[PDB]
């Protein structure tokens, strides 16, 4: 319950922060969240990022800095960034929404 | 805005080539922290945009 509250707050401030708007689907979508990454998946994702970015060493070098520390959700966050490179439209929105807030 | 732990991950995504403003980055990280699948985060992010 007080879990779901936090999810709703998160959905809500994004709607606010991204200038949106039925977002009850996002609640259902985010509420199927059952636990498992693979060793290739993070490799597959990781090579795809390094292709995309300029300065790929910086990404890889601080991937390395930050895996030795076991920092939390490192690999699911890197999987997300690979997924974001693919969809060039929503990559650009996030790109722009950040220009708006400076 | 966001703390040493999140500051690292932001720098990571940053040198990874993407830029998203610290405020939404913080929430994403948080959605991950509450064990939401990255794909689910991505899917809703995709829907929330154009």
Automatic annotation (TrEMBL), chain A:
Physiological role: Component of the gamma-tubulin ring complex (gTuRC) which mediates microtubule nucleation.
Q: What is the lineage of its organism?
A: Eukaryota, Metazoa, Chordata, Craniata, Vertebrata
Q: Where in the cell is it found?
A: Cytoplasm, Cytoskeleton, Microtubule organizing center
Family assignment from sequence similarity: Belongs to the TUBGCP family.
Source species, domain of life? Eukaryota
Q: What is this protein called?
A: Gamma-tubulin complex component
Q: Organism source for this protein? A: Xenopus laevis
Portion of the full-length sequence here: 1 to 106 of 523
Originating gene: tubgcp2.L
């Amino acid at each position: 319950s007080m879990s779901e509250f936090r999810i709703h707050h998160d959905v809500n401030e994004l709607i606010s922060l991204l200038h949106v708007f039925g977002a009850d689907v996002y609640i259902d979508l985010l509420q199927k969240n059952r636990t498992v990454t693979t060793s290739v998946s993070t490799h597959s994702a990781k090579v795809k990022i390094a292709e995309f970015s300029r300065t790929p060493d910086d990404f890889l070098k601080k991937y390395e800095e930050l895996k030795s520390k076991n920092t939390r959700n490192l690999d699911p966050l890197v999987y997300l960034l690979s997924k974001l490179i693919e969809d060039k439209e929503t990559l650009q929105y996030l790109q722009q929404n950040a220009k708006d807030k400076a | 805005v966001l703390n040493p732990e999140e500051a690292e991950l932001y720098e990571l995504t940053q040198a990874a080539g993407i830029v998203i403003d610290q405020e939404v980055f913080k929430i994403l990280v948080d959605l991950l922290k509450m064990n939401v699948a990255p794909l689910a985060v991505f899917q809703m992010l995709k829907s929330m945009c154009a």
